[PDB]
Design an enzyme around this catalytic site. Sequence first.
Site, PDB file in Angstrom:
ATOM      1  N   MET A  29       0.830  -1.210   0.000  1.00  0.00           N
ATOM      2  CA  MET A  29       0.000   0.000   0.000  1.00  0.00           C
ATOM      3  C   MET A  29       0.863   1.258   0.000  1.00  0.00           C
ATOM      4  O   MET A  29       0.660   2.155  -0.818  1.00  0.00           O
ATOM      5  CB  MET A  29      -0.918   0.014   1.225  1.00  0.00           C
ATOM      6  CG  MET A  29      -2.036  -0.974   1.157  1.00  0.00           C
ATOM      7  SD  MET A  29      -3.149  -0.672   2.536  1.00  0.00           S
ATOM      8  CE  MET A  29      -2.616  -1.909   3.634  1.00  0.00           C
ATOM      9  N   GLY A  30       1.809   1.285   0.933  1.00  0.00           N
ATOM     10  CA  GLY A  30       2.763   2.354   1.165  1.00  0.00           C
ATOM     11  C   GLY A  30       3.408   2.150   2.517  1.00  0.00           C
ATOM     12  O   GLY A  30       3.175   1.127   3.169  1.00  0.00           O
ATOM     13  N   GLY A  35       7.546   1.373   9.403  1.00  0.00           N
ATOM     14  CA  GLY A  35       7.349   0.167   8.617  1.00  0.00           C
ATOM     15  C   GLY A  35       6.606   0.376   7.318  1.00  0.00           C
ATOM     16  O   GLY A  35       6.444   1.510   6.858  1.00  0.00           O
ATOM     17  N   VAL A  37       2.990  -0.961   5.303  1.00  0.00           N
ATOM     18  CA  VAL A  37       1.666  -1.518   5.572  1.00  0.00           C
ATOM     19  C   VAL A  37       1.222  -2.316   4.349  1.00  0.00           C
ATOM     20  O   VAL A  37       1.152  -1.772   3.241  1.00  0.00           O
ATOM     21  CB  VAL A  37       0.638  -0.444   6.028  1.00  0.00           C
ATOM     22  CG1 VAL A  37      -0.698  -1.078   6.396  1.00  0.00           C
ATOM     23  CG2 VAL A  37       1.178   0.347   7.212  1.00  0.00           C
ATOM     24  N   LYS A  50       1.374  -4.524   9.390  1.00  0.00           N
ATOM     25  CA  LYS A  50       2.436  -3.543   9.429  1.00  0.00           C
ATOM     26  C   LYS A  50       3.761  -4.218   9.728  1.00  0.00           C
ATOM     27  O   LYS A  50       4.027  -4.540  10.890  1.00  0.00           O
ATOM     28  CB  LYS A  50       2.114  -2.447  10.459  1.00  0.00           C
ATOM     29  CG  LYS A  50       2.970  -1.192  10.350  1.00  0.00           C
ATOM     30  CD  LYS A  50       2.838  -0.366  11.620  1.00  0.00           C
ATOM     31  CE  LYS A  50       3.552   0.955  11.530  1.00  0.00           C
ATOM     32  NZ  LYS A  50       2.753   1.948  10.773  1.00  0.00           N
ATOM     33  N   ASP A 133       2.553  11.784  18.315  1.00  0.00           N
ATOM     34  CA  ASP A 133       2.691  11.912  16.858  1.00  0.00           C
ATOM     35  C   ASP A 133       1.341  12.110  16.134  1.00  0.00           C
ATOM     36  O   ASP A 133       1.019  11.371  15.201  1.00  0.00           O
ATOM     37  CB  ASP A 133       3.518  10.758  16.237  1.00  0.00           C
ATOM     38  CG  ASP A 133       4.231  11.091  14.912  1.00  0.00           C
ATOM     39  OD1 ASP A 133       4.367  12.312  14.578  1.00  0.00           O
ATOM     40  OD2 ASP A 133       4.694  10.143  14.235  1.00  0.00           O
ATOM     41  N   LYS A 135      -0.864  13.606  13.488  1.00  0.00           N
ATOM     42  CA  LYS A 135      -0.652  14.137  12.132  1.00  0.00           C
ATOM     43  C   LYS A 135      -1.647  13.465  11.177  1.00  0.00           C
ATOM     44  O   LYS A 135      -2.108  12.353  11.467  1.00  0.00           O
ATOM     45  CB  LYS A 135       0.809  13.968  11.660  1.00  0.00           C
ATOM     46  CG  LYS A 135       1.307  12.539  11.620  1.00  0.00           C
ATOM     47  CD  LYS A 135       2.718  12.465  11.151  1.00  0.00           C
ATOM     48  CE  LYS A 135       3.172  11.033  11.189  1.00  0.00           C
ATOM     49  NZ  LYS A 135       4.465  10.848  10.478  1.00  0.00           N
ATOM     50  N   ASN A 138      -1.565   9.782  10.229  1.00  0.00           N
ATOM     51  CA  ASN A 138      -1.922   8.891  11.352  1.00  0.00           C
ATOM     52  C   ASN A 138      -3.409   8.892  11.666  1.00  0.00           C
ATOM     53  O   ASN A 138      -3.842   8.217  12.608  1.00  0.00           O
ATOM     54  CB  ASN A 138      -1.122   9.268  12.607  1.00  0.00           C
ATOM     55  CG  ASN A 138       0.315   8.800  12.595  1.00  0.00           C
ATOM     56  OD1 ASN A 138       0.764   8.058  11.721  1.00  0.00           O
ATOM     57  ND2 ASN A 138       1.064   9.211  13.582  1.00  0.00           N
ATOM     58  N   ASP A 151      -0.878   4.653  15.306  1.00  0.00           N
ATOM     59  CA  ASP A 151       0.541   4.791  15.653  1.00  0.00           C
ATOM     60  C   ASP A 151       0.767   5.257  17.087  1.00  0.00           C
ATOM     61  O   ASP A 151       1.002   6.443  17.322  1.00  0.00           O
ATOM     62  CB  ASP A 151       1.302   5.673  14.638  1.00  0.00           C
ATOM     63  CG  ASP A 151       2.188   4.887  13.692  1.00  0.00           C
ATOM     64  OD1 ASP A 151       1.647   4.127  12.869  1.00  0.00           O
ATOM     65  OD2 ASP A 151       3.424   5.045  13.766  1.00  0.00           O
TER      66      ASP A 151
HETATM   67  N1  LIG Z   1      -0.258   4.829  10.989  1.00  0.00           N
HETATM   68  C1  LIG Z   1      -0.092   4.054   9.930  1.00  0.00           C
HETATM   69  O1  LIG Z   1       0.986   3.919   9.353  1.00  0.00           O
HETATM   70  C2  LIG Z   1      -1.323   3.326   9.441  1.00  0.00           C
HETATM   71  C3  LIG Z   1      -1.279   1.820   9.710  1.00  0.00           C
HETATM   72  C4  LIG Z   1      -1.208   1.356  11.205  1.00  0.00           C
HETATM   73  C5  LIG Z   1      -2.623   1.038  11.647  1.00  0.00           C
HETATM   74  C6  LIG Z   1      -3.286   0.795  10.352  1.00  0.00           C
HETATM   75  S1  LIG Z   1      -4.888   0.211  10.013  1.00  0.00           S
HETATM   76  C7  LIG Z   1      -4.653   0.577   8.329  1.00  0.00           C
HETATM   77  N2  LIG Z   1      -5.590   0.355   7.411  1.00  0.00           N
HETATM   78  C8  LIG Z   1      -5.247   0.774   6.185  1.00  0.00           C
HETATM   79  N3  LIG Z   1      -4.117   1.379   5.795  1.00  0.00           N
HETATM   80  C9  LIG Z   1      -3.220   1.586   6.750  1.00  0.00           C
HETATM   81  O2  LIG Z   1      -2.161   2.402   6.548  1.00  0.00           O
HETATM   82  C10 LIG Z   1      -1.872   2.885   5.205  1.00  0.00           C
HETATM   83  C11 LIG Z   1      -0.386   3.138   5.235  1.00  0.00           C
HETATM   84  C12 LIG Z   1       0.081   3.655   3.887  1.00  0.00           C
HETATM   85  C13 LIG Z   1      -0.669   4.909   3.449  1.00  0.00           C
HETATM   86  N4  LIG Z   1      -0.168   5.382   2.146  1.00  0.00           N
HETATM   87  C14 LIG Z   1       0.583   6.638   2.075  1.00  0.00           C
HETATM   88  C15 LIG Z   1       1.311   6.699   0.753  1.00  0.00           C
HETATM   89  O3  LIG Z   1       0.410   6.568  -0.361  1.00  0.00           O
HETATM   90  C16 LIG Z   1      -0.344   5.344  -0.285  1.00  0.00           C
HETATM   91  C17 LIG Z   1      -1.103   5.212   1.022  1.00  0.00           C
HETATM   92  C18 LIG Z   1      -2.197   4.773   3.569  1.00  0.00           C
HETATM   93  C19 LIG Z   1      -2.627   4.167   4.918  1.00  0.00           C
HETATM   94  C20 LIG Z   1      -3.408   1.154   8.090  1.00  0.00           C
HETATM   95  C21 LIG Z   1      -2.613   1.259   9.271  1.00  0.00           C
END
Ligand SMILES: NC(=O)C[C@H]1CCc2sc3ncnc(O[C@H]4CC[C@H](N5CCOCC5)CC4)c3c21
Length: 272
Positions: A29-30, A35, A37, A50, A133, A135, A138, A151
């Site tokens: 995803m990114g 870390g 995800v 994560k 943190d 933002k 988050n 986070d």
């Molecule tokens: N605090 C975090 O790191 C979120 C984590 C922890 C807890 C969870 S629960 C969850 N569900 C869905 N996505 C999630 O984090 C994606 C992380 C990549 C993102 N990207 C940015 C760049 O461009 C692409 C998207 C989009 C959201 C998460 C997460």
Amino acid sequence: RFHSFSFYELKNVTNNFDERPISVGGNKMGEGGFGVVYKGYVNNTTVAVKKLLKQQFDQEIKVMAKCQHENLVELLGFSLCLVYVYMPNGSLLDRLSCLDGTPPLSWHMRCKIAQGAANGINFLHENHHIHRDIKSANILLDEAFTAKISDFGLATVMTSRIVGTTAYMAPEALRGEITPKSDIYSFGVVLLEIITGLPAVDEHREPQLLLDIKEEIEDEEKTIEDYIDKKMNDADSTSVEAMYSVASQCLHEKKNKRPDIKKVQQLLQEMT
Ligand SMILES: NC(=O)C[C@H]1CCc2sc3ncnc(O[C@H]4CC[C@H](N5CCOCC5)CC4)c3c21
């Protein structure tokens, strides 16, 4: 309790940790600060895995065990990997920047997200926890666009190592002072991102820091109206001025002059 998961039990779900975008057909995803995800599946139930620092892994689990709320992400398990209920609408940061062609968030939606996030911070503070943190990256969004704080790896006392995002950090936080008041300042920056649709920092922008606009408005150079996200069709001066007033109050340089999260909730509630 969280289910006892093994690294094997969480490697397969991510298609042997497939580092490719979903828009093309992959599992990455990114990134998420400490870390990456990955999208996962635990019996036709989408999860966020994560893959990651050991103490920060331990801290998320401790905070998650004690804190269950409508406006906090849900931890299902762990193995280093952490497993959560998947947030289908990603982060507030991604949605404010319409990443991957998602339509802009309406003013109505933005008010609901702002309220939800404050309920989340209030719950943490009521349970004597400082986030450290806050933002827009988050603040995640569910299926109904509910704000869910995430986070907790970093959750008046001084520290040797200053941690958080500098563009969102309170003056004292940058000086090593840990206070729930720092979370208020950081939330004020998030409110500015909601109103403006602008990231807190952009190296290719004048001003580079978003909280510098508070001083252009305060020193009567510009107004909040000159900065309202032009990607909305439903905003109104009254509620926009009301949310700006809260952000302005949050962004006091003197921590004792900032409102507590309870007064912040109340003000956002009054706004609608
Ligand atoms: N605090 C975090 O790191 C979120 C984590 C922890 C807890 C969870 S629960 C969850 N569900 C869905 N996505 C999630 O984090 C994606 C992380 C990549 C993102 N990207 C940015 C760049 O461009 C692409 C998207 C989009 C959201 C998460 C997460």
